[PDB]
Amino acid sequence: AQVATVPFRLGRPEELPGTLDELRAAVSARAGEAVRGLNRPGARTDLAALLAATERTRAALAPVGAGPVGDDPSESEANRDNDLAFGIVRTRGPVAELLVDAALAALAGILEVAVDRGSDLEDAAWQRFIGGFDALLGWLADPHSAPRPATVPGAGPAGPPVHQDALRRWVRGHHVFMVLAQGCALATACLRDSAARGDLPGAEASAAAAEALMRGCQGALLYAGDANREQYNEQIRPTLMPPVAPPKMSGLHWRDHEVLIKELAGSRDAWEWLSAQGSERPATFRAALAETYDSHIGVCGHFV
Numbered sequence: 251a252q253v254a255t256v257p258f259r260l261g262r263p264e265e266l267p268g269t270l271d272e273l274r275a276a277v278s279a280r281a282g283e284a285v286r287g288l289n290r291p292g293a294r295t296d297l298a299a300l301l302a303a304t305e306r307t308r309a310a311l312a313p314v315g316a317g318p319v320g321d322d323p324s325e326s327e328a329n330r331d332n333d334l335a336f337g338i339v340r341t342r343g344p345v346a347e348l349l350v351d352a353a354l355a356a357l358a359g360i361l362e363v364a365v366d367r368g369s370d371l372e373d374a375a376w377q378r379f380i381g382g383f384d385a386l387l388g389w390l391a392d393p394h395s396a397p398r399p400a401t402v403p404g405a406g407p408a409g410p411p412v413h414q415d416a417l418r419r420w421v422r423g424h425h426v427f428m429v430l431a432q433g434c435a436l437a438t439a440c441l442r443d444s445a446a447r448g449d450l451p452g453a454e455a456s457a458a459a460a461e462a463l464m465r466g467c468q469g470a471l472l473y474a475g476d477a478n479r480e481q482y483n484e485q486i487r488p489t490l491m492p493p494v495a496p497p498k499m500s501g502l503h504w505r506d507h508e509v510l511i512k513e514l515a516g517s518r519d520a521w522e523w524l525s526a527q528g529s530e531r532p533a534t535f536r537a538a539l540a541e542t543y544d545s546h547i548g549v550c551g552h553f554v
Protein backbone atom coordinates (compact mmCIF):
# COMPACT_ATOMS: atom_id res chain seq x y z
CA ALA A 251 0.00 0.00 0.00
CA GLN A 252 2.33 2.71 -1.35
CA VAL A 253 4.71 1.59 1.37
CA ALA A 254 7.61 2.60 -0.86
CA THR A 255 8.36 3.42 -4.47
CA VAL A 256 9.12 0.04 -6.01
CA PRO A 257 11.11 -1.53 -7.73
CA PHE A 258 14.04 -0.13 -5.75
CA ARG A 259 16.85 -0.54 -8.25
CA LEU A 260 20.33 -1.38 -6.98
CA GLY A 261 23.45 -2.83 -8.58
CA ARG A 262 25.29 -5.98 -7.59
CA PRO A 263 27.59 -5.15 -4.62
CA GLU A 264 30.16 -7.74 -5.77
CA GLU A 265 30.97 -5.35 -8.66
CA LEU A 266 31.63 -2.23 -6.60
CA PRO A 267 34.93 -0.53 -7.58
CA GLY A 268 37.77 -1.24 -5.20
CA THR A 269 40.21 1.66 -5.62
CA LEU A 270 39.83 5.43 -5.31
CA ASP A 271 40.99 5.99 -8.90
CA GLU A 272 38.54 3.39 -10.27
CA LEU A 273 35.73 4.80 -8.13
CA ARG A 274 36.35 8.37 -9.32
CA ALA A 275 36.36 7.29 -12.96
CA ALA A 276 33.13 5.37 -12.42
CA VAL A 277 31.03 7.86 -10.51
CA SER A 278 32.51 11.24 -9.63
CA ALA A 279 30.88 13.12 -12.54
CA ARG A 280 27.39 11.86 -11.64
CA ALA A 281 27.89 12.19 -7.88
CA GLY A 282 29.03 15.79 -8.40
CA GLU A 283 25.80 16.59 -10.23
CA ALA A 284 23.83 14.96 -7.41
CA VAL A 285 25.64 17.04 -4.78
CA ARG A 286 25.10 20.25 -6.73
CA GLY A 287 21.43 19.34 -7.13
CA LEU A 288 20.96 18.76 -3.40
CA ASN A 289 22.77 22.01 -2.49
CA ARG A 290 21.16 24.30 -5.06
CA PRO A 291 19.82 27.68 -3.90
CA GLY A 292 16.81 27.11 -1.68
CA ALA A 293 17.32 23.35 -1.27
CA ARG A 294 18.13 23.63 2.44
CA THR A 295 15.56 26.21 3.61
CA ASP A 296 13.20 23.49 4.85
CA LEU A 297 12.49 19.78 4.50
CA ALA A 298 9.89 20.43 1.77
CA ALA A 299 12.45 22.33 -0.29
CA LEU A 300 14.99 19.53 0.15
CA LEU A 301 12.45 17.01 -1.14
CA ALA A 302 11.72 19.21 -4.18
CA ALA A 303 15.45 19.57 -4.86
CA THR A 304 15.97 15.82 -4.53
CA GLU A 305 13.21 15.05 -7.05
CA ARG A 306 14.46 17.73 -9.46
CA THR A 307 17.99 16.38 -9.12
CA ARG A 308 17.10 12.79 -9.91
CA ALA A 309 14.84 13.78 -12.81
CA ALA A 310 17.73 15.80 -14.23
CA LEU A 311 20.09 12.80 -14.23
CA ALA A 312 20.28 10.66 -17.36
CA PRO A 313 19.16 7.08 -16.60
CA VAL A 314 21.82 4.39 -16.52
CA GLY A 315 19.93 1.21 -15.71
CA ALA A 316 19.63 -1.56 -18.28
CA GLY A 317 16.72 -3.37 -16.65
CA PRO A 318 16.86 -6.27 -14.21
CA VAL A 319 19.96 -8.42 -13.89
CA GLY A 320 17.71 -11.45 -14.27
CA ASP A 321 19.53 -14.78 -14.18
CA ASP A 322 22.44 -14.34 -11.78
CA PRO A 323 24.24 -17.59 -10.95
CA SER A 324 25.89 -15.90 -7.93
CA GLU A 325 22.47 -15.14 -6.36
CA SER A 326 20.98 -17.78 -4.08
CA GLU A 327 17.24 -18.18 -3.71
CA ALA A 328 17.70 -16.82 -0.18
CA ASN A 329 19.42 -13.71 -1.60
CA ARG A 330 16.50 -13.27 -3.99
CA ASP A 331 13.91 -13.72 -1.23
CA ASN A 332 15.80 -11.18 0.88
CA ASP A 333 15.64 -8.60 -1.93
CA LEU A 334 12.04 -9.34 -2.96
CA ALA A 335 10.78 -8.89 0.61
CA PHE A 336 11.71 -5.20 0.32
CA GLY A 337 10.97 -4.65 -3.36
CA ILE A 338 14.65 -4.61 -4.36
CA VAL A 339 15.49 -5.32 -8.01
CA ARG A 340 19.13 -5.96 -8.83
CA THR A 341 19.72 -3.94 -11.98
CA ARG A 342 22.31 -4.05 -14.76
CA GLY A 343 24.48 -1.03 -15.44
CA PRO A 344 27.32 0.94 -13.84
CA VAL A 345 27.03 -0.17 -10.22
CA ALA A 346 28.45 3.00 -8.66
CA GLU A 347 26.20 5.25 -10.77
CA LEU A 348 23.24 3.05 -9.85
CA LEU A 349 24.23 3.69 -6.22
CA VAL A 350 23.93 7.44 -6.78
CA ASP A 351 20.43 6.97 -8.24
CA ALA A 352 19.46 4.67 -5.37
CA ALA A 353 20.74 7.15 -2.77
CA LEU A 354 18.62 9.95 -4.24
CA ALA A 355 15.53 7.72 -4.40
CA ALA A 356 15.94 6.43 -0.83
CA LEU A 357 16.41 10.03 0.32
CA ALA A 358 13.22 11.10 -1.45
CA GLY A 359 11.45 8.10 0.08
CA ILE A 360 12.42 9.24 3.58
CA LEU A 361 11.61 12.90 3.00
CA GLU A 362 8.15 12.20 1.55
CA VAL A 363 7.05 10.71 4.87
CA ALA A 364 8.85 13.28 7.01
CA VAL A 365 7.57 16.29 5.05
CA ASP A 366 3.98 15.04 5.34
CA ARG A 367 3.92 13.66 8.86
CA GLY A 368 7.04 14.70 10.78
CA SER A 369 9.47 12.55 12.73
CA ASP A 370 9.79 11.55 16.38
CA LEU A 371 13.55 11.12 15.97
CA GLU A 372 15.92 13.14 18.12
CA ASP A 373 17.36 16.05 16.14
CA ALA A 374 20.90 14.69 16.47
CA ALA A 375 19.74 11.32 15.12
CA TRP A 376 17.89 13.02 12.26
CA GLN A 377 21.06 15.00 11.48
CA ARG A 378 23.35 12.01 11.26
CA PHE A 379 20.66 9.99 9.42
CA ILE A 380 20.05 12.50 6.63
CA GLY A 381 23.71 13.52 6.86
CA GLY A 382 24.55 10.00 5.71
CA PHE A 383 23.38 10.92 2.21
CA ASP A 384 25.52 14.08 2.10
CA ALA A 385 28.53 12.09 3.25
CA LEU A 386 27.99 9.41 0.61
CA LEU A 387 27.37 11.67 -2.37
CA GLY A 388 29.99 14.22 -1.30
CA TRP A 389 32.64 11.51 -0.97
CA LEU A 390 31.66 9.87 -4.25
CA ALA A 391 31.96 13.30 -5.90
CA ASP A 392 35.60 13.55 -4.75
CA PRO A 393 36.76 10.24 -3.21
CA HIS A 394 40.31 11.46 -2.54
CA SER A 395 39.14 14.06 0.02
CA ALA A 396 37.17 13.65 3.21
CA PRO A 397 33.53 14.70 2.67
CA ARG A 398 32.47 17.94 4.29
CA PRO A 399 29.03 18.05 5.98
CA ALA A 400 26.24 20.40 4.94
CA THR A 401 23.24 21.79 6.78
CA VAL A 402 20.28 19.43 7.25
CA PRO A 403 16.81 20.97 7.78
CA GLY A 404 14.95 19.59 10.74
CA ALA A 405 11.68 17.72 10.66
CA GLY A 406 8.51 18.77 12.39
CA PRO A 407 7.21 16.60 15.21
CA ALA A 408 5.28 13.42 14.48
CA GLY A 409 1.74 14.11 13.35
CA PRO A 410 -1.37 11.97 13.80
CA PRO A 411 -0.84 8.25 13.12
CA VAL A 412 -1.81 7.03 9.65
CA HIS A 413 -2.50 3.34 9.06
CA GLN A 414 0.75 1.38 8.61
CA ASP A 415 2.98 4.45 8.38
CA ALA A 416 5.35 2.47 10.61
CA LEU A 417 5.64 -0.16 7.89
CA ARG A 418 6.32 2.53 5.27
CA ARG A 419 9.16 3.88 7.42
CA TRP A 420 10.43 0.35 8.15
CA VAL A 421 10.61 -0.48 4.43
CA ARG A 422 11.99 2.87 3.25
CA GLY A 423 14.55 2.68 6.05
CA HIS A 424 15.81 -0.64 4.70
CA HIS A 425 16.24 0.98 1.28
CA VAL A 426 18.55 3.44 3.07
CA PHE A 427 20.41 0.52 4.71
CA MET A 428 21.22 -0.95 1.32
CA VAL A 429 22.62 2.33 -0.01
CA LEU A 430 24.75 2.93 3.07
CA ALA A 431 25.96 -0.67 3.17
CA GLN A 432 27.24 -0.38 -0.41
CA GLY A 433 28.70 3.05 0.30
CA CYS A 434 30.53 1.90 3.40
CA ALA A 435 31.77 -1.21 1.54
CA LEU A 436 33.21 1.10 -1.12
CA ALA A 437 34.88 3.30 1.50
CA THR A 438 36.35 0.31 3.38
CA ALA A 439 37.62 -1.31 0.17
CA CYS A 440 39.34 1.92 -0.87
CA LEU A 441 40.87 2.28 2.59
CA ARG A 442 42.31 -1.23 2.29
CA ASP A 443 43.63 -0.63 -1.23
CA SER A 444 45.04 2.81 -0.45
CA ALA A 445 46.85 1.59 2.63
CA ALA A 446 48.23 -1.47 0.84
CA ARG A 447 49.66 0.85 -1.81
CA GLY A 448 51.06 3.26 0.81
CA ASP A 449 48.66 6.06 -0.24
CA LEU A 450 48.21 7.69 3.17
CA PRO A 451 46.02 10.61 1.96
CA GLY A 452 43.75 8.20 0.11
CA ALA A 453 43.53 5.97 3.19
CA GLU A 454 42.65 9.01 5.32
CA ALA A 455 39.96 10.16 2.91
CA SER A 456 38.54 6.62 2.72
CA ALA A 457 38.44 6.25 6.52
CA ALA A 458 36.73 9.63 6.85
CA ALA A 459 34.05 8.46 4.42
CA ALA A 460 33.69 5.15 6.29
CA GLU A 461 33.17 6.87 9.63
CA ALA A 462 30.63 9.36 8.28
CA LEU A 463 28.73 6.55 6.55
CA MET A 464 28.89 4.47 9.74
CA ARG A 465 27.37 7.33 11.71
CA GLY A 466 24.71 7.60 9.00
CA CYS A 467 23.96 3.89 9.44
CA GLN A 468 23.47 4.40 13.19
CA GLY A 469 20.97 7.15 12.44
CA ALA A 470 19.16 4.90 9.98
CA LEU A 471 19.04 2.12 12.58
CA LEU A 472 17.52 4.50 15.13
CA TYR A 473 14.99 5.52 12.48
CA ALA A 474 14.13 1.89 11.70
CA GLY A 475 14.07 0.96 15.39
CA ASP A 476 11.57 3.74 16.03
CA ALA A 477 9.42 2.37 13.19
CA ASN A 478 9.80 -1.19 14.49
CA ARG A 479 8.59 -0.25 17.97
CA GLU A 480 5.53 1.44 16.45
CA GLN A 481 5.02 -1.65 14.27
CA TYR A 482 5.03 -3.91 17.34
CA ASN A 483 2.32 -1.82 19.02
CA GLU A 484 0.27 -2.06 15.82
CA GLN A 485 0.53 -5.88 15.93
CA ILE A 486 -1.22 -6.15 19.31
CA ARG A 487 -4.59 -6.11 17.52
CA PRO A 488 -5.48 -9.78 16.91
CA THR A 489 -6.68 -10.50 13.40
CA LEU A 490 -9.03 -13.15 12.06
CA MET A 491 -7.16 -13.11 8.76
CA PRO A 492 -3.69 -14.75 8.79
CA PRO A 493 -1.39 -12.16 10.38
CA VAL A 494 0.82 -10.20 7.98
CA ALA A 495 4.37 -10.04 9.29
CA PRO A 496 6.61 -7.12 8.26
CA PRO A 497 9.47 -8.03 5.92
CA LYS A 498 12.71 -8.99 7.64
CA MET A 499 16.27 -8.99 6.38
CA SER A 500 18.20 -12.23 6.75
CA GLY A 501 21.75 -11.16 7.50
CA LEU A 502 23.24 -14.35 6.06
CA HIS A 503 21.45 -13.72 2.78
CA TRP A 504 21.61 -9.90 2.51
CA ARG A 505 24.34 -9.41 -0.12
CA ASP A 506 25.24 -5.76 0.52
CA HIS A 507 25.77 -6.42 4.23
CA GLU A 508 27.79 -9.54 3.48
CA VAL A 509 30.10 -7.54 1.19
CA LEU A 510 30.39 -4.77 3.80
CA ILE A 511 31.34 -6.98 6.72
CA LYS A 512 33.90 -8.84 4.59
CA GLU A 513 35.59 -5.56 3.68
CA LEU A 514 35.48 -4.41 7.32
CA ALA A 515 37.26 -7.60 8.27
CA GLY A 516 40.71 -7.24 6.87
CA SER A 517 40.49 -3.47 7.05
CA ARG A 518 41.86 -3.97 10.58
CA ASP A 519 45.50 -3.45 9.60
CA ALA A 520 44.65 -0.31 7.62
CA TRP A 521 42.94 1.18 10.68
CA GLU A 522 45.97 0.46 12.88
CA TRP A 523 48.32 1.88 10.22
CA LEU A 524 46.28 5.10 10.05
CA SER A 525 46.53 5.33 13.84
CA ALA A 526 50.31 4.80 13.75
CA GLN A 527 50.56 7.56 11.11
CA GLY A 528 48.79 9.98 13.45
CA SER A 529 45.20 9.79 12.22
CA GLU A 530 42.27 10.47 14.52
CA ARG A 531 39.84 8.63 12.23
CA PRO A 532 40.47 5.15 13.77
CA ALA A 533 39.44 6.20 17.27
CA THR A 534 36.26 7.98 16.15
CA PHE A 535 35.43 5.20 13.67
CA ARG A 536 35.74 2.65 16.48
CA ALA A 537 33.18 4.65 18.46
CA ALA A 538 30.83 4.91 15.49
CA LEU A 539 31.27 1.17 14.91
CA ALA A 540 30.33 0.17 18.47
CA GLU A 541 27.34 2.53 18.39
CA THR A 542 26.09 1.10 15.09
CA TYR A 543 26.53 -2.46 16.33
CA ASP A 544 24.52 -1.74 19.50
CA SER A 545 21.79 -0.04 17.47
CA HIS A 546 21.06 -3.33 15.75
CA ILE A 547 19.08 -4.18 18.90
CA GLY A 548 15.45 -3.53 18.09
CA VAL A 549 15.96 -3.63 14.33
CA CYS A 550 17.55 -6.88 13.22
CA GLY A 551 15.74 -10.16 13.87
CA HIS A 552 18.97 -11.92 14.90
CA PHE A 553 19.50 -9.45 17.78
CA VAL A 554 17.67 -8.67 21.05
Ligand code: HEC
Pocket residue numbers: 426427428430431434464467470499500501502504507511514515539542543546549550551552
Ligand atom coordinates in the same frame (compact mmCIF):
# COMPACT_ATOMS: atom_id res chain seq x y z
C1 HEC B 1 19.50 -7.76 10.55
C2 HEC B 1 19.43 -8.62 9.26
C3 HEC B 1 20.60 -6.70 10.29
C4 HEC B 1 20.46 -5.48 9.78
C5 HEC B 1 19.12 -4.73 9.59
C6 HEC B 1 21.77 -4.85 9.78
N1 HEC B 1 22.70 -5.82 10.11
FE1 HEC B 1 24.59 -5.41 10.58
N2 HEC B 1 24.76 -7.31 11.51
C7 HEC B 1 23.79 -8.30 11.40
C8 HEC B 1 24.31 -9.52 11.97
C9 HEC B 1 23.58 -10.88 12.06
C10 HEC B 1 25.71 -9.19 12.46
C11 HEC B 1 26.66 -10.21 13.15
C12 HEC B 1 27.20 -9.69 14.47
C13 HEC B 1 28.00 -10.78 15.17
O1 HEC B 1 27.89 -11.98 14.78
O2 HEC B 1 28.75 -10.43 16.12
C14 HEC B 1 25.91 -7.79 12.13
C15 HEC B 1 27.04 -7.05 12.38
C16 HEC B 1 27.38 -5.87 11.78
C17 HEC B 1 28.67 -5.20 11.87
C18 HEC B 1 29.93 -5.68 12.63
C19 HEC B 1 30.92 -6.30 11.65
C20 HEC B 1 32.27 -6.49 12.32
O3 HEC B 1 32.33 -6.30 13.56
O4 HEC B 1 33.27 -6.79 11.64
C21 HEC B 1 28.60 -4.09 11.15
C22 HEC B 1 29.69 -3.02 10.92
C23 HEC B 1 27.28 -4.01 10.60
N3 HEC B 1 26.55 -5.09 11.00
C24 HEC B 1 26.83 -2.99 9.80
C25 HEC B 1 25.51 -2.79 9.52
C26 HEC B 1 25.03 -1.61 8.90
C27 HEC B 1 26.07 -0.54 8.49
C28 HEC B 1 23.70 -1.74 8.75
C29 HEC B 1 22.68 -0.74 8.16
C30 HEC B 1 23.17 -0.15 6.82
C31 HEC B 1 23.33 -3.02 9.32
N4 HEC B 1 24.46 -3.63 9.78
C32 HEC B 1 22.07 -3.56 9.40
C33 HEC B 1 22.54 -8.16 10.84
C34 HEC B 1 22.00 -6.97 10.43
